[PDB]
Design a protein around this ligand. Sequence first.
Ligand SMILES: *[C@@H]1O[C@H](CO)[C@@H](O[C@@H]2O[C@H](CO)[C@@H](O[C@@H]3O[C@H](CO)[C@@H](O)[C@H](O)[C@@H]3O)[C@H](O)[C@H]2NC(C)=O)[C@H](O)[C@H]1NC(C)=O
Ligand SMILES: *[C@@H]1O[C@H](CO)[C@@H](O)[C@H](O)[C@H]1NC(C)=O
Length: 277
Amino acid sequence: EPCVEVVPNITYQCMELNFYKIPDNLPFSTKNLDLSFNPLRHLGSYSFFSFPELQVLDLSRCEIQTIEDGAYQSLSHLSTLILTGNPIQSLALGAFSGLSSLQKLVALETNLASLENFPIGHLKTLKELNVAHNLIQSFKLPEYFSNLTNLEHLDLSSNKIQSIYCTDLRVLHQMPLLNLSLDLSLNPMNFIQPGAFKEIRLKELALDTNQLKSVPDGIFDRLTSLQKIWLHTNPWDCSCPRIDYLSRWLNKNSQKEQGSAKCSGSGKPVRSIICPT
Ligand SMILES: *[C@@H]1O[C@H](CO)[C@@H](O[C@@H]2O[C@H](CO)[C@@H](O[C@@H]3O[C@H](CO)[C@@H](O)[C@H](O)[C@@H]3O)[C@H](O)[C@H]2NC(C)=O)[C@H](O)[C@H]1NC(C)=O
Ligand SMILES: *[C@@H]1O[C@H](CO)[C@@H](O)[C@H](O)[C@H]1NC(C)=O
């Protein structure tokens, strides 16, 4: 059965077997399938009909370029789907149809340019969405996010986001509350419109290694749910009183800040700056 049997009728390692399609010489009760590094090129409808028992499918670096409507139509118990490294250049509006139990979607490096046309509007069970390392330019969350009521982890790091406007998180208002861990680090971000995190419950915020020089006063006021924040490796402008707010704040919430936001030029910790009144 060319793939390796990690666990009888359960787990198999088919990576780098030079497959052009999904194998059929595997038990139907399979739960974990790793097909990474196989030139699959395309995924038509019912490409996993002979695996209605899957829960974890790894399709990393499979050279997949398109996924037709109902490609995973069968897979009703798939929990984790890894598509990392695939040069996707076409995604059917029903490409993810059939995944009624998907909790973790990993789409690192899949030429994603807009969450707008990202067909995940029907995945209510989605807990983690990792779309880091992509071409996303805007942080404006599509209104279909109001349907992803279980989403507790969102990674948009290493994309092309330049700023965070008040409208971006609009949708997160007209929907249920939840512990959302947001990662927006490693972005060419240099602006954050005032009051963009109000009424928004955030557990963790990652804004490190961007292009931020300053942040609106009171940007992190009512975030009692906040536990971890990253702001280090940013060209912070510590002139006064422009840096007054962030100074005191980061100084009070010291145990929350991971790493240390430093002043450009001096390299002085922003937390240890005191602006005269
Ligand atoms: C992985 O799946 C295979 C099925 O292809 C398992 O082997 C099969 O085991 C069943 C028993 O569950 C055997 O079927 C029948 O079992 C009854 C038990 O009462 C017995 O009375 C019958 O005579 C008959 O054996 C079947 O023969 C057998 N087939 C194979 C593969 O030889 C295998 O055990 C599974 N491995 C794991 C993960 O346990
Ligand atoms: C969930 O959101 C999608 C996207 O707008 C919508 O089509 C659907 O009716 C909503 N409810 C369901 C059926 O999940």
